[PDB]
């Protein structure tokens, strides 16, 4: 139910992972080490986060797994964008890892991804995305992935959940008291940005997979696993 759902999401927010720039100037290797070390740690916390969304731990194991494998990059990126929303031309990876757009030149293939992330962030900035809208959108990202039938009521349980999240978002948007038509436009504007987030995610995944192959960066543990597919 919308108010309670929204408070649960609020209380579910994962902590800020702290990381710092290395002492030496960035290289491709050292930049990738920093961002993957950050991602890996944030992944740990994303599991605990997901488990706090009502219903999530009532879905089947394969379902929880499949949603998390499918959305984790998207969720990393969404959280990044929210962190960076007030800081044009910058990506706020962590309080002490604030990358200027140009610093992406450091890593082959990454500037384009920074620009996508930056563009999607500006679009949220233009729309004046509100904290509670961000909470709902991020949970929708967890819940809204293709789930063609696997061969292993969880699917209806999924729909009910994503339904309640979508209602919560509609309810948050109602608080603005704007025109009915403009409440529809805003919903559409926020959900249409979900594709952009999926799209960046796709480029991010591919970029990192390739970095891993070229042994340009070692990846460990959770991140390594989520990567191995």
């Amino acid at each position: 139910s919308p108010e309670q759902l929204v408070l649960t999401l609020l209380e579910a927010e994962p902590p800020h992972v702290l990381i710092s720039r290395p002492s030496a100037p960035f290289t491709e290797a050292s930049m990738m080490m920093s961002l993957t070390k950050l991602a890996d740690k944030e992944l740990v916390h994303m599991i605990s986060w997901a488990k706090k969304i009502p219903g999530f731990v009532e879905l089947s194991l394969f379902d929880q797994v499949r949603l998390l494998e499918s959305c984790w990059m998207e969720v990393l990126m969404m959280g990044l964008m929210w962190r960076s929303i007030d800081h044009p031309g910058k990506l706020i990876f962590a309080p002490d890892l604030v990358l200027d757009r140009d610093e992406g030149k450091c890593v082959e293939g990454i500037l384009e991804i920074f620009d996508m992330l930056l563009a999607t962030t500006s679009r949220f900035r233009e729309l004046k995305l509100q904290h509670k809208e961000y909470l709902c959108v991020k949970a929708m990202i967890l819940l809204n992935s293709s789930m063609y039938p696997l061969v292993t009521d969880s699917s209806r349980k999924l729909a009910h959940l994503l339904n309640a999240v979508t209602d919560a978002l509609v309810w948050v948007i109602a608080k603005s008291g704007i025109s009915s038509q403009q409440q529809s436009m805003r919903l559409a504007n926020l959900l249409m940005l979900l594709s952009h987030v999926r799209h960046a995610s796709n480029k991010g995944m591919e970029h990192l997979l390739n970095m891993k192959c070229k042994n340009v960066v070692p990846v460990y543990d959770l991140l390594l696993e989520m990567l191995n597919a």
């Binding site: 488990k51 731990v57 929880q64 998390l68 696993e225």
Partner: peptide
């Protein structure tokens, strides 16, 4: 395959 994920979910 989800050696660690399963671990953390359960």
């Amino acid at each position: 395959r989800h050696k660690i994920l399963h671990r953390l979910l359960q």
